[PDB]
């Protein structure tokens, strides 16, 4: 069972005894830190998943100081663990945490350098707890980052989707989530996944559903879609000379409903133009739009591979020329690459299959390590500092300012988010915010004292997160 | 509750319907692939797996309701086979008719060689090996963790025996300070536990925890830390007392090692004017066991590592070890923690050496780099069918991508053997039953859902050992 007294790093263990002594009051900041592809803004998601599963509640019990004391005495060979203050939370709270949590909604999308959560202690004797969790707290840089990333793409996506069509039609379905196996764990799954559903309907990691159900909720029954398809090893199990009965029962099997069929086993080329093209063209010809046969080619450079094999099919398949002036494969007939794209390799296919005249409504993607492992809190600079603290009754505006890098200094005294004259985020420090001249405070209540009082379902959450260009 | 029957890529749902009709028999097997770096891997993490999510009773009857009322909606449609899960929990209580052969944890093997097998033990049951890949493949991270952390103590051992003429730390000089870098709570544990078969150094307890119920060690714990501290204690004090705060922070941790952060303002007036003048009693006089550890976090990392030891070598005595290297009093330490990964892990050492510095002065901490800035196409960490039974005849499958070379995957049964000279081989297409390379050294670890075989932690880190250290 979770013990959140052991969930934070060594270090923090011994920082009760560090403070200045007389400190009533540590009031830290989360911020995606400005740095000196430029990921601008941020959306901001998976807080209210961090507080549900680990903040909120009884979290302190006798037998969890106990379990703590005994490993941190092993642990750091001597005894520094802070057990009094522990005890403290479990006699006086009933083990619930005295703190408070503001954040801006969640779904938000907020330009960098700006407060998005705070956190402070709401007992004088606890001063010592807000940075006790900030390395709980911080891996929200997680799904801040995913959700950032896939938004995004959906941005390139856009973009290229109306330029060569004229619409935006089917958009939610153009990067679909393959990243259940490439990610670290199952509890990243979950959450990778339930980010990227933010941006997108697609996905085939499974754990996000859940996820989402259990902390976030949706109207419709689920948040994410699928749709059948083979893998290497439902075609390589027919044997090698036998690779058009494989198609052609797969096809069959699904004959009703989209189903993509991955064709490079042996030669993506020849499975295109003879066997696709040629031996099962009959199969092909007659399905439905809604039912379409998705190729999915899967090695080879992406953005070559791409070009050649629409280039095969469209000289063996019906193409037409839509208003834009871009060529588009029959409705029975499409394509998804699936291999090795990422952001900087969706922008190459999308303006390569651009500069050939070939329109992005023939093509979806897929990402999976690209999508929700090739990612660090370096990307968005996500960081937790303090920056107010209260010491023999006096506040202080407390902050760090390396010498050699200015892109890590820190923001000063207590912080609050508000809207612009020109309806841009402001980030006020210093307690400025209370002169009240920039409206009300985007940040809002989210946990106290060890309940969650603030929460979003995820349909408010998408809402938030829309495009410009969607809400045009 | 973790439910298997969810834990899969959506598309596998649908792939009982795509093999060959009358196939009672799929095998599959995952290897690091081979492609000048990551030579070698750890195999590290697969014992976790089988014991959190693929042993004992994994199929009931509420999971397979959910799993079918889930599929309908991610589906559209009713696609879920709902006999072969109830096939499964009627005939075998919900155990998994399964067998995974795997080499020994801790090993280290050159890529491209299998490193475990599956196969299904009930011809009923063809379609479920596949179904398991995505949770298996999951191992990826902690062999690359693992794997990436040895390398890491090559490049170690490599300078510490060349600047000091013995490995004396070693195993202290690579600090895990990843727990905050990591996309969760879950992965925090499984990496830390990776990079702990190599060191005993760490700030993320998760792996504390996941070590003691899935491994076990001799030792109480697995890895160890000391008291420090961070920017939020020293900036606290305000601007104008970062000297209060290092006076009292090193105070009140007089008899142990200390951590102190030093670049809140200016590391080198910290260096230099604070623990070089003001505070230089406090420093001159603790003992050996407990020295005072400082730690820059903000530019450039070598160039910030030489300009610091520079100025401590100024301020304190420094001797001339038996290598000729320069080496701070015992009393005094740095440890760089920011920005280190691989790469500017090697460049720091080197850095070092070219000044006549011992790797004795200094250890690294490293977050993102260790835990997090890894991927699966790192050491191509990949799960391949390569064996079928069809009608009763078995048959050799694989892919063989004409465009890429580096895909093709192995045919038929396999088995791991020693050659010669000793070195590992992987023979394909059954050849191991010809017996002309000695017995398969790969070993049943799972059979229809019970673990068949384990290995400690202890055991785990004998066979990750270093040549350097053997
Ligand atoms: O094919 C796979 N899954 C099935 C699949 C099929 C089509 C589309 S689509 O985007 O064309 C699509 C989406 C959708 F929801 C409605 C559609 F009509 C069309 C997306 C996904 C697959 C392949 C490799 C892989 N590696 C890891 C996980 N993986 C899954
Ligand atoms: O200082 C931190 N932790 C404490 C710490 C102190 C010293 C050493 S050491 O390698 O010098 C050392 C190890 C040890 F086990 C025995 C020693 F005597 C010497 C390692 C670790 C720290 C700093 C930043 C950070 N970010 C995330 C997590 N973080 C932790």
Redesign the interface.
């Known amino acids: 069972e979770?013990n959140i007294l052991?969930?934070?790093?060594?270090?923090?263990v011994?920082?009760y005894?560090?403070?200045?002594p007389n400190?009533s009051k540590?009031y830290?900041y989360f911020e995606c830190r400005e740095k000196k592809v430029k990921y601008e803004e941020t959306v901001f998601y998976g807080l209210q998943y961090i507080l549900n599963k680990?903040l909120k509640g009884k979290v302190v019990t006798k037998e969890k100081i106990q379990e703590a004391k005994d490993?941190y005495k092993?642990?750091?060979?001597?005894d520094?663990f802070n057990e009094k203050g522990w005890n403290y939370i479990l006699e006086k709270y009933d083990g619930h945490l005295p703190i408070e949590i503001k954040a801006v909604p969640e779904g938000f999308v907020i330009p960098r350098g700006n407060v998005l959560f705070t956190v402070e202690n709401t007992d004088p004797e606890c001063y010592w707890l807000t940075?006790w969790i900030?390395?709980?707290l911080?891996?929200s840089?997680?799904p801040i980052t995913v959700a950032t990333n896939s938004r995004e793409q959906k941005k390139i996506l856009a973009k290229y989707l109306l330029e060569t069509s004229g619409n935006l039609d089917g958009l939610e379905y153009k990067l679909h989530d393959?990243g259940?196996?490439?990610?670290?764990?199952?509890?990243?799954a979950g959450?990778?996944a339930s980010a990227h559903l933010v941006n997108f309907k697609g996905?085939?990691?499974?754990?996000g559903?859940?996820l989402i159900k259990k902390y976030y909720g949706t109207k419709d029954?689920?948040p994410?879609?699928?749709?059948?398809?083979?893998?290497?090893?439902?075609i390589?199990?027919?044997?090698?000379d036998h690779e058009k009965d494989?198609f052609e029962?797969?096809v069959t099997?699904?004959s009703s409903?989209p189903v993509?069929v991955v064709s490079?086993?042996?030669?993506?080329?020849?499975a295109c133009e003879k066997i696709w093209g040629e031996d099962l063209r009959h199969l092909i010809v007659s399905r439905s739009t809604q039912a379409p046969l998705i190729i999915r080619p899967?090695?080879?450079?992406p953005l070559d591979?791409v070009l050649k094999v629409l280039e095969i099919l469209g000289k063996k398949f019906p193409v037409t020329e839509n208003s834009k002036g871009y060529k588009l494969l029959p409705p029975y007939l499409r394509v998804i690459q699936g291999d090795g794209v990422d952001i900087n390799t969706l922008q190459e296919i999308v303006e390569g299959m651009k500069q050939k005249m070939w329109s992005i409504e023939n093509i979806a993607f897929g990402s999976g390590?690209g999508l929700l492992?090739?990612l660090?809190?370096?990307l968005l600079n996500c960081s937790?500092?303090?920056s107010y603290?209260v010491?023999n009754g006096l506040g202080?505006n407390?902050?760090?300012?390396?010498?050699?890098?200015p892109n890590?200094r820190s923001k000063k005294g207590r912080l609050s988010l508000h809207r612009t004259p020109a309806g841009n985020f402001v980030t006020l420090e210093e307690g400025k915010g209370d002169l009240e001249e920039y409206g009300q405070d985007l940040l809002h209540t989210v946990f106290k004292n060890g309940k969650v009082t603030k929460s979003y379902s995820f349909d408010e959450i998408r809402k938030n997160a829309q495009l410009n260009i969607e809400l045009e």
């Open positions: 979770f052991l969930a934070t790093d060594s270090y923090k011994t920082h005894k560090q403070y200045p400190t540590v830290s680990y490993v092993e642990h750091f060979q001597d520094v940075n900030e390395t709980i911080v891996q840089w997680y393959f259940y196996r490439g990610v670290s764990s199952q509890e990243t959450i990778g996905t085939d990691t499974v754990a559903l859940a029954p689920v994410g879609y699928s749709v059948p398809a083979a893998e290497h090893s439902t390589t199990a027919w044997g090698k494989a029962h797969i099997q699904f409903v993509s490079d086993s042996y030669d993506i080329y020849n899967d090695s080879g450079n591979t390590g492992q090739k660090t809190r370096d937790f500092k303090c603290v010491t202080i407390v902050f760090k300012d390396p010498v050699a890098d890590k």
